[PDB]
């Protein structure tokens, strides 16, 4: 939902009043990708146990 | 039987030579 996919693209083009809005959509979207990977690796460790 | 954005692979404690001795 942000304007770009590169953190240097938003920082080197936009203003710091606006730069805190587009970065917030990137940290929230990337934290859910790590929570899915850690949870799936924790269930697979129960099968190998 | 048969990537640098914070990902890393740790080596195991028991190597392949010590498993075959057991």
């Amino acid at each position: 939902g942000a304007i770009s996919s590169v953190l240097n693209d938003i920082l080197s083009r936009l203003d710091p009043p606006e730069a805190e809005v587009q970065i917030d959509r990137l940290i929230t979207g990337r934290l859910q990708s790590l929570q899915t990977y850690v949870t799936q690796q924790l269930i697979r460790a129960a099968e190998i146990r | 039987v048969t990537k640098f954005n914070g990902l890393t692979v740790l080596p195991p404690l028991l190597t392949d030579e010590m498993i075959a001795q057991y």
Partner: protein, 329 residues
């Protein structure tokens, strides 16, 4: 922040440390110098025929001007507040001198004082319904200044025209200069003056004694994409020589990264500017000036672990660096 023994205590939150291994932090390799590179260009952009022109075009019969292959001095018109209306929403106006773009699209015309506010992306108006409106991907902003003392004549400046009525709705980036009559009623006028059929072309009644809502404004919209293609025109930057065998922050016409620069040893095409891997990261960088192709390989990797015995016995500790060859360290 003194020794790795006490640095483990700020992570474990205890004054007595059990023996074993503990992960504390990671590496951070500093770069030394900045690499910037831009192709050799010395032309000046035609700004004298846009802002310093005597007469302008019309909003009904506009013609988009293309400007390329030059350098733009954006520190004289964007710093000085010699214009009446200047707001900017998508581009930061303070740093146009180091970001580079391909081409700028300018439209020099004039509108009244009540018509400079209703031009916006996604917002309707008397210009946005019949004359001109902007799409959603507009990256840029507008320059507008009041010109009631020079453009307005005593009897009315009748050199300029604008549209009133249109039978349909606009789609972005289109010109309609047709003289088709409007049919508002049920009677077919068929291009003849009569009832419920009005002539949409209207000249400007430019007079210096009018209100501020009807005062003429010398306006120009500027359209340019930001890092969508190999660029041609940007401001007065300076060059820096190429340094190898050290991971630094490079700026090759917007392509910003951090890593070592080694020589490439693979096949390439004369119409290829960069190479990418499966992980969608930049692997090669084309030089704008020389005919050389470099390789990208990052630095600042590895984790730091502290091997320590129990604090009840001794205080001699050691440190293990995870997965990094210590010839560089």
């Amino acid at each position: 922040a003194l020794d790795p023994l006490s640095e483990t205590k700020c992570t474990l939150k205890s004054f007595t440390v059990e023996k074993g291994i503990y992960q504390t932090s990671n590496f951070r390799v500093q770069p030394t110098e900045s690499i910037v590179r831009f192709p050799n260009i010395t032309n000046l952009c035609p700004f004298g025929e846009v802002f310093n022109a005597t007469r302008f075009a019309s909003v009904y019969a506009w013609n988009r001007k293309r400007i390329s292959n030059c350098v733009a001095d954006y520190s004289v018109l964007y710093n000085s507040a010699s214009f009446s209306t200047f707001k900017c929403y998508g581009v930061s106006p303070t740093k146009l001198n180091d970001l580079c773009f391909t081409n700028v699209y300018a439209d020099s015309f004039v509108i009244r004082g009540d018509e400079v506010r209703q031009i916006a992306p996604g917002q309707t108006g008397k210009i946005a319904d019949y004359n001109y409106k902007l799409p959603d991907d507009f990256t840029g902003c507008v320059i507008a200044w009041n010109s009631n003392n020079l453009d307005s004549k005593v009897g009315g400046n009748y050199n300029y025209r604008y549209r009133l009525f249109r039978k349909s709705n606009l789609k972005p980036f289109e010109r309609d200069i047709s003289t088709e009559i409007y049919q508002a009623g049920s009677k077919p006028c068929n291009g003849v003056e009569g009832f419920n059929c009005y002539f949409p072309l209207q000249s400007y009644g430019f007079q210096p004694t009018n209100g501020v809502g009807y005062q003429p404004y010398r306006v120009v919209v500027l359209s340019f994409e930001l890092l969508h293609a190999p660029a041609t025109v940007c401001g007065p930057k300076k060059s820096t020589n190429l340094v190898k065998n050290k991971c630094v922050n490079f700026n090759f016409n917007g392509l910003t990264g951090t890593g070592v620069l080694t020589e490439s040893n693979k096949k390439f095409l004369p119409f290829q500017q960069f190479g990418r891997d499966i992980a969608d990261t930049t692997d090669a960088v084309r030089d704008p000036q020389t005919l050389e192709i470099l390789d990208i390989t990052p630095c600042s990797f590895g984790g730091v672990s502290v091997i320590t015995p129990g604090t009840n016995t001794s205080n001699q500790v050691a440190v293990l660096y995870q997965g990094v060859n210590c010839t560089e360290v």
